[PDB]
Symmetry: C3
Subunit: 127 residues, 3 copies
């Protein structure tokens, strides 16, 4: 049984929702207004904590709009299934234009990616 | 299901994406146009393809390794839903101080069909 | 049955390890002293070769601390299940300060992502 458990850390938090029926990702909204300086970065809180199943992780993935319109990309974004701290989104601004994130703007989408995690076998030949 | 990958050409410039080694993750994507990705800038490179991938996956537009080292090229955005039937364009960021030229038919990215889970969003206090 | 095979290519390589039971990734360490120049890139050798199962790839993925503290991002990062050459991490530096890497520094994390690789078919009409 897959699951996506979400805890609001604030009254500011928006519960993530999927944008199309067969959408890969749950949209993540900013819990703050924040500058993202030209050629710099910002750490935007979501005011959520999450849990996802073992055998998956939550990837905070970029939105196509912020990227193509504002040259905004998402850094880091690997949220382990046992990570219970608050979810923040790191944004990089790859343009000479200051940008600003507004409270409640969708800044990323969370994608619950299937993975495997076997124990490493060291070999002298990989075959 | 049975997984599948259907592509529809939107012009005769589109190239059928193909894999590159039998256990290969990704299907090479070719540019449909002559264009460029400016130094320290960005471009949308059309593929002239529309695609379908199975429910419980998405198509990730992912960077080629050769272009990353040689041109400082990275893919922006790149999340194509199993739902999406519009044209597929590749957002490229150029993290160097020289323009990156693209000719029609060059490989500018690779598409990976990643398995995902899509449950309902269950709010808690944990 | 998933596996993760690793071959050391020198005594400078470190076997990737997972932080917690539910960690998505295996930490990767630099086999070299190097640097990522301000606004530039580097290829950092791992001195590893690897093999992962058919139906997966190894994604080279970013550490969040490095993203936030140093504006470090991972470029490239798609390692095919049948790629048997040396694993190098490409790093982009989205700040104006050079980033030093010391031999044994953790520079990325490896995630073994589940995928499908069906036979592509061109069609006249989409579903
Ligand atoms: Mg992925």
């Amino acid at each position: 049984s897959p699951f996506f458990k979400v805890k609001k850390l604030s009254e500011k938090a928006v519960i993530p929702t999927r944008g199309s029926p067969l959408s890969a990702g749950y949209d993540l909204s900013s819990a703050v207004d924040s500058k993202v300086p030209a050629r710099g970065k910002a750490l935007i809180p979501t005011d959520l904590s999450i849990a996802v199943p073992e055998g998956t992780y939550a990837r905070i993935a970029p939105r196509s709009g912020l990227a193509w319109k504002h040259s905004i990309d998402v850094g880091a974004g690997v949220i382990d299934a046992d990570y219970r701290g608050p979810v923040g989104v790191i944004l990089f601004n790859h343009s000479d234009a200051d940008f600003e994130v507004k409270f409640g703007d969708r800044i990323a989408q969370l994608i619950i990616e299937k993975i495997v995690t076997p124990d490493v076998v060291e070999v002298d030949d990989l075959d």
